Amino acid sequence: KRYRYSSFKARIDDLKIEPARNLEKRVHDYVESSHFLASFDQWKEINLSAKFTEFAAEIEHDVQTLPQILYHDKKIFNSLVSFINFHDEFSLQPLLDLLAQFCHDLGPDFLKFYEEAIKTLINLLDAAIEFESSNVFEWGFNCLAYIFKYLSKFLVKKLVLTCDLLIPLLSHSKEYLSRFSAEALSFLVRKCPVSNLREFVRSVFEKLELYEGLLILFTESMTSTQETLHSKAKAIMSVLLHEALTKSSPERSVSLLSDIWMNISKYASIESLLPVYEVMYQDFNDSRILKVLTTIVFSEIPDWNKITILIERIMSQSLSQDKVAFLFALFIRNSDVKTLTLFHQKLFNYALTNISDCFLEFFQFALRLSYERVFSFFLQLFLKKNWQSQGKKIALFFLEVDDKPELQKVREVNFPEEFIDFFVTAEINDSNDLFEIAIIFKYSKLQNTEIIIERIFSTFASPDNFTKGTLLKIYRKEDDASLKTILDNYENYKESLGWNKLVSNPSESLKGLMSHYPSLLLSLTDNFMLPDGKIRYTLMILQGMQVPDMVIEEIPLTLQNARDLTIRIKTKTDKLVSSFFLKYLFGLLTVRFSPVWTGVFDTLPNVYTKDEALVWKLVLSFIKLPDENQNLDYYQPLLEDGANKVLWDSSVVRLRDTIDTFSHIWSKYSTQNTSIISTTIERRGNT
Amino acid sequence: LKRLAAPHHWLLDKLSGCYAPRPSAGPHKLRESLPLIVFLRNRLKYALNGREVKAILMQRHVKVDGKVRTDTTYPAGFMDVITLDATNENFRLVYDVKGRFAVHRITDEEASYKLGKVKKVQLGKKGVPYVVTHDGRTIRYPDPNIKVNDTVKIDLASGKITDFIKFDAGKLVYVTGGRNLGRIGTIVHKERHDGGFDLVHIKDSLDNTFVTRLNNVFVIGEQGKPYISLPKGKGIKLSIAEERDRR
Amino acid sequence: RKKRKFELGRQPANTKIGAKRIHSVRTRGGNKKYRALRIETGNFSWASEGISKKTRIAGVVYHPSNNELVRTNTLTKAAIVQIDATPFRQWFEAHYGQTLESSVESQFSAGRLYACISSRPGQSGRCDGYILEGEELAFYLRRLTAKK
Amino acid sequence: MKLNISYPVNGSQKTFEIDDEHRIRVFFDKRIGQEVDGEAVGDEFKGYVFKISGGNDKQGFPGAIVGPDLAVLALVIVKKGEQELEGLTDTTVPKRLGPKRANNIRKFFGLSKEDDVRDFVIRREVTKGEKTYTKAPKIQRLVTPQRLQRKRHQRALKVRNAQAQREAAAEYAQLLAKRLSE
RNA sequence: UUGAUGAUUCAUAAUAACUUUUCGAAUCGCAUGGCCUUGUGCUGGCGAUGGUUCAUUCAAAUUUCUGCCCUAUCAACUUUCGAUGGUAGGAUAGUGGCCUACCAUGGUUUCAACGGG
RNA sequence: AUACAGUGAAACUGCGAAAAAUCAGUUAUCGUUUAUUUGAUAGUUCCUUUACUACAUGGUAUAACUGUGGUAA
């Protein structure tokens, strides 16, 4: 199977110049002592374009005998320029190949024409963008790289002039023109010596403010060798790049050098990095170097990294530093450096945000420094750890109560001195942090409930209730006072932590008829609270709790059919709970098998057990409903950015920047602590 | 797949297997067309075998009168152009003195258009006058002085008409089909029966008053100033015996 | 496409009135035909003023090639049928202002007119007739006397 | 007698093995889809509605009156009762493939036509041993950016063709005007 | 003030309806461009399939007439169960007894109809 | 690549498997089909539409598959 019919983009992405790796091409090194006559009389016999044959009819007396080439230098170049800028698509391989062999044959006398040739072929490459045929700029970039391969001996000073001529091919806002120009310039970088290279890169760093991606492609193809190794110019190209960096450059220069280090470390990655990292560390010993350190440590040497980080931390003490410490803790394999780095980051600031980023990256170990960070001295990190995963909460349970207990008693005293929307928000900001701090807090929470007698403040009272037989009497008092899912979780915590039945019982069938809202999680928590309350004060209720807690779709359809069959074969509390959970299954609106099974089993039992009222309630729930919980103030953001545009380092920087924006400031932290939201008020347009 | 008795002005080799190519449906008839297999395989010899002809057809190198027509058995018959983009070539295929399909190498400025005899002028739909031609290009809105058995000059970028040669007594003519093939000249007599068998008689350098069927003739232009070039001395068929007597 | 055989035929459509049914039949080369079977309605048109209307056909009272088709009430081409006369009477009253030719004004108050089938609903798919008027009306009144 | 009975609500089937030749007498003279009682045919289940469809004798053949060679009898469950038989009503089988059309997945997840679904697709999981592979089927008949671009191009194609045609008609009108004038 | 044909009731347009209904794109691969009302906003190319009607093409279908052995101890054949024509219809992609009704009683032939190998 | 993306079993689909007696020609199809190829070909589908609407595009009904068997092949 051949003749694949690649697309234009397929041809270009599979295309790459590398004229040394253009393997054989023995069409011109078999020189008949003139070399232009060799390529010319080969192309006159293989290709017959109309204007190429007219070009040969204009030129043919003036091609043979290399002294008669060198005498008639102007007319042949003016004819070649006229026909190239004529640019039929069919006559572009012979003209560009003749230009390449023409520069090969002249050499040092080509320099008078060198600044016309490049801009004429640049107009040709823009015309090839319009032409849409990959062969055209295949030939064009091959002839350009041949011009570089034959004039690299004399393009020593004028690298800045050839980049001034090759700006509209590095930066064109087309993607592939950048890479195709950049690897030819990269071959020209694998050339002219180190002092000219460093002054060239110091003169080209001014063009940063698609030039960044173009220079990234140029430096990457320069340092990169053939296969699974780095080139011989890498151990000096990294030195020239790092010495043109370090505060004698622009702003995005560290980001471009970091992207170059990431691309080279992704490409070579086996043994040639052992020759690059030595010169890189020896040049980076002289001192933002944290961006280079994060680039060196992100891509998965540890002793030298530890020594350099120790020198960096000492020079800093005598953000991006938190990101570098997070990456070192996530990537290193050294126990002594890690145990020293814990105390170093403790001496550093924003330890709560660093612990949040480190737990998000890799929850490794060492939760015993956040206790000292809290004793030195909050809300949102402990809130996210409390609402975090299973092992995350099991590790945050250690330093939940092990915080600054003086500050916890201070928060308890400031909560006992009650003030009582914004005051409830201040009470919630105290309550979520002081929840991990008995009867005194319970009576103060009852006083706060009586004083507040919005739904977020109800959930804050629920958070204090989850923080809590005196507690049973306090829960009876809150029952006398009786989001809602957090309230049902608080009721489950209260029933997990007689005369109360003689006081209350009403509430059982009320919670049963309330367990039909637009949240299966709220239905599960309400059924849990009803089961615990009916226990402390049943078979179909526990079966419905099990069946409400594609194979899951068929099993849930059969299970809801079985529970409806049992309720059809068989108290008023059980009847109301079965009808409300059946309405919850018919308005779950997230599994069509269950939403068919409930509506197919409901028309067998008795009607008018609040059935027409529940159906009218479902048909009238789409009338008018919205939400507006609370608000806060505003602050600033958008800092700690060591990179912009690369591989997955950009995604990791976006994740750490979003975490720092969540835990960023006072007003941002208040809004993000308010942003912890309850179950949804949803499921419209199908009920 | 019925073959081995082809139209014998194709001149295929007889020790070339058994069969012979079947021209598909197209703008011309069966035994007065010439498919691109017979063209590119045994008429100018650019490809050896028929699947290599299929390769050069599939690779978009050949276009008959404007567009590509990637097809082996495509009956590109008389008077059209074949603009081979590579080799800079414009094959117009015209007739010869003997009965074969002679080739040209047309300039681009003449290959930009083609011509052809009409077959009828009609009113198609919604009261729209449209003409046809011999190669099926039923084109709309002519000049309504177009008569039957007349030639229009198709623009071949669009399908418009640039000019037409309103034939009458005395404007330069071509012939096609019949045993008086490849002759020019239009001025002796103009016969018109009722049911065919009639010609505008011919006058040449030797003034040979010749006739054929009126279906077997169509026009080119003015006397001495033709719209198409003609191959090998603007074919006359004087005599081969007189040619070997003189030269 | 289009072979030949020696000698056979097919079963006719020989349509009736009442319970209109249309059965499509396969035609080689386009124009898929329709046999009307027992069709009860038809398109009937005035010749002079030129107005059609779909009208419930009452019955064929004359056939010029088989008398038994009038007995079986067969709707072929070129028969003599009665229909309703009321929408043509409605257009006549509406746009002439007469509110009623002589030998059709005498048929109006009788109630049902005479018309001629021109389609072939045994093969075509529909039934049309035009109301006879003029010398056709003269010879078909003579054909009514040939009936009686 | 082998009985392959299918419970289509749970999509399962099982073969029972039945005695009772005077219930084979009941199975005789039954049309395709007649009332057959579950407790009356079976001492192992109670009170259903069974409708026959067809049966295979020896060599497996497809009037409606069955014969005595009918070893295999196919039954479907119409009206379930309560009994949890371990072969018909207990065994839950999964749906092999989920929905593929856009409005079909909108009906299957109840999705409120402003959603732009593109995330509720039913994944399936494989792993060669070290590298995981999750696979999402496709969503055809879905409003991608391509289809309305194609509809836009169709509409503009029809309008542009009509524009060029009604330009050429006016050009022929001026040509007939000048042919009148000469 | 009108197209062509040797020739039209041709081509076509309008008129008044009937449409068990026709078609008038719910499709596909590649690039992703220009704009500014930065919205998943407006537009945009190359060409694969499908469809209305006309022309051409091939393919099929009948139908015209010129043309083949030995024969009159082979001269009558055919209308039955249409054999030969008309008229209307059924039919049929279609003309046409190809069939159905009513009317007429024909047709072929000695120059070898019809039959014999 | 959290709709899929190049690879492809199987299956659905699309297309194609069509002894004046024979004939060799000749004439017409203004007495039929015109599939395939080629060239032109079409703004009109809701407006008893503001208690304003499927078109940023709506519905089934199944193969391959999964499962139960027969069977002597």
Curated annotation (Swiss-Prot), chain A:
Similarity comment: family membership: Belongs to the UTP20 family.
Subunit relationships: Interacts with snoRNA U3. Interacts with MPP10. Component of the ribosomal small subunit (SSU) processome composed of at least 40 protein subunits and snoRNA U3.
Intervals holding HEAT repeats: 210-246, 450-481, 515-545
Name under which the protein is recorded: U3 small nucleolar RNA-associated protein 20
Purpose of the protein: Involved in nucleolar processing of pre-18S ribosomal RNA and ribosome assembly.
Subcellular location(s) per record: Cytoplasm; Nucleus, Nucleolus
Superkingdom of this protein's organism: Eukaryota
Gene expressing this chain: UTP20
Species this protein is from: Saccharomyces cerevisiae (strain ATCC 204508 / S288c) (Baker's yeast)
Curated annotation (Swiss-Prot), chain B:
GO cellular component, one term: 90S preribosome
Localization terms from the record: Cytoplasm
Keywords from the UniProt entry: Cytoplasm, Isopeptide bond, Phosphoprotein, Ribonucleoprotein, Ribosomal protein, RNA-binding, rRNA-binding, Ubl conjugation
Residue positions where Phosphothreonine is found in the record: T107
Pfam annotation, one family: 40S_S4_C
Record-listed Phosphoserine modification sites: S24, S239
Superkingdom, taxonomy of origin: Eukaryota
GO molecular function, one term: rRNA binding
Gene3D superfamilies the UniProt entry points to: 2.30.30.30, 2.40.50.740, RNA-binding S4 domain (3.10.290.10)
Domain S4 RNA-binding: 34-97
TM segment ranges: none
Cross-link Glycyl lysine isopeptide (Lys-Gly) (interchain with G-Cter in ubiquitin) placement: K54, K126, K153, K160, K166, K171, K203, K225
InterPro entries hit by this protein: KOW, Rib_uL2_dom2, Ribosomal_eS4, Ribosomal_eS4_C, Ribosomal_eS4_central_region, Ribosomal_eS4_central_sf, Ribosomal_eS4_KOW, Ribosomal_eS4_N
Entries under PROSITE patterns matching the protein: RIBOSOMAL_S4E (PS00528), S4 (PS50889)
GO biological process: cytoplasmic translation; translation
Role noted for this protein: Component of the ribosome, a large ribonucleoprotein complex responsible for the synthesis of proteins in the cell. The small ribosomal subunit (SSU) binds messenger RNAs (mRNAs) and translates the encoded message by selecting cognate aminoacyl-transfer RNA (tRNA) molecules. The large subunit (LSU) contains the ribosomal catalytic site termed the peptidyl transferase center (PTC), which catalyzes the formation of peptide bonds, thereby polymerizing the amino acids delivered by tRNAs into a polypeptide chain.
Miscellaneous: Present with 573 molecules/cell in log phase SD medium. There are 2 genes for eS4 in yeast.
Family, as annotated: Belongs to the eukaryotic ribosomal protein eS4 family.
Family matches, as HAMAP family: Ribosomal_eS4 (MF_00485)
Protein name: Small ribosomal subunit protein eS4A
From Swiss-Prot, chain C:
Entries under InterPro entries matching the protein: Ribosomal_eS8, Ribosomal_eS8_CS, Ribosomal_protein_eS8_euk, Ribosomal_Se8/biogenesis_NSA2
Presence of the UniProt keyword Plastid in the record: no
Superkingdom as given in the UniProt entry: Eukaryota
CDD domains linked: Ribosomal_S8e_like
Subcellular location field: Cytoplasm
Modified residues (Phosphoserine): S45, S48, S52, S65, S102, S103, S106, S109
Modified residues (Phosphothreonine): T41, T86
The entry's keywords: Cytoplasm, Phosphoprotein, Ribonucleoprotein, Ribosomal protein
GO molecular function, one term: structural constituent of ribosome
GO-annotated cellular components: 90S preribosome; cytosol; cytosolic small ribosomal subunit
Primary location: cytoplasm
Gene Ontology biological-process annotations: maturation of SSU-rRNA from tricistronic rRNA transcript (SSU-rRNA, 5.8S rRNA, LSU-rRNA); translation
Subunit structure of this chain's protein: Component of the small ribosomal subunit (SSU). Mature yeast ribosomes consist of a small (40S) and a large (60S) subunit. The 40S small subunit contains 1 molecule of ribosomal RNA (18S rRNA) and 33 different proteins (encoded by 57 genes). The large 60S subunit contains 3 rRNA molecules (25S, 5.8S and 5S rRNA) and 46 different proteins (encoded by 81 genes).
Protein family according to the UniProt entry: Belongs to the eukaryotic ribosomal protein eS8 family.
Miscellaneous field: Present with 15900 molecules/cell in log phase SD medium.
UniProt-recorded name of the protein: Small ribosomal subunit protein eS8A
Species of the source: Saccharomyces cerevisiae (strain ATCC 204508 / S288c) (Baker's yeast)
From Swiss-Prot, chain D:
Cross-link (Glycyl lysine isopeptide (Lys-Gly) (interchain with G-Cter in ubiquitin)): K80, K95, K113, K178
Keyword Ribonucleoprotein: yes
Keywords: Cytoplasm, Isopeptide bond, Nucleus, Phosphoprotein, Ribonucleoprotein, Ribosomal protein, Ribosome biogenesis, rRNA processing, Ubl conjugation
Taxonomy, superkingdom: Eukaryota
GO CC terms in record: 90S preribosome; cytosol; cytosolic small ribosomal subunit; nucleolus; nucleoplasm; small-subunit processome
GO biological process, one term: maturation of SSU-rRNA from tricistronic rRNA transcript (SSU-rRNA, 5.8S rRNA, LSU-rRNA)
Coiled coil: none
Cellular localization per UniProt: Cytoplasm; Nucleus, Nucleolus
Primary location group: cytoplasm
GO terms of molecular function: structural constituent of ribosome
Miscellaneous note of the record: Present with 66000 molecules/cell in log phase SD medium.
Name of the protein in its database record: Small ribosomal subunit protein eS6A
